[PDB]
Amino acid sequence: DKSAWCEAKNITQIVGHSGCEAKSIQNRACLGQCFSYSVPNTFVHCDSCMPAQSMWEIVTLECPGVDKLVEKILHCSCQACGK
């Protein structure tokens, strides 16, 4: 047997990067191994590990002491590679 796994991995991202001072925040990244298969015909399925739940959060930078929008990934799951 082989199982499909998709997980939200803890990361630190650094927003940067304009003429202001960068900040580090805690986030998640999706990482996984979903099933895909391709069966031939005569004249097909793709899943990938992507955000299942996320939210937008504002991060304010000091210059040197602007706002930046960041995506907070909460959960991940195997979904159709379509969109």
Added chain:
Amino acid sequence: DKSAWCEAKNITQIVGHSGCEAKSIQNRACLGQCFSYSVPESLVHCDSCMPAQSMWEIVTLECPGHEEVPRVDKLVEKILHCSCQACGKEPSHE
């Protein structure tokens, strides 16, 4: 075990057409678990197990049915090799 794998599996498919005699051929199907990952949208990395090399082959069926159109041709895709590749890339591989 924590590795991405893409398997070209031997199959037998059956090619047919009404009023004709079916044929079985040997083909391969791709099956796998490629890595995908997403960072916070911008850098999406999507791989899937898809044909790396394929070809079109004609298969002729006999239709002992009929004197005009005693036989018929069908086009089939032969999958030769499979591999983890960037998603959305077209299956057909030549």
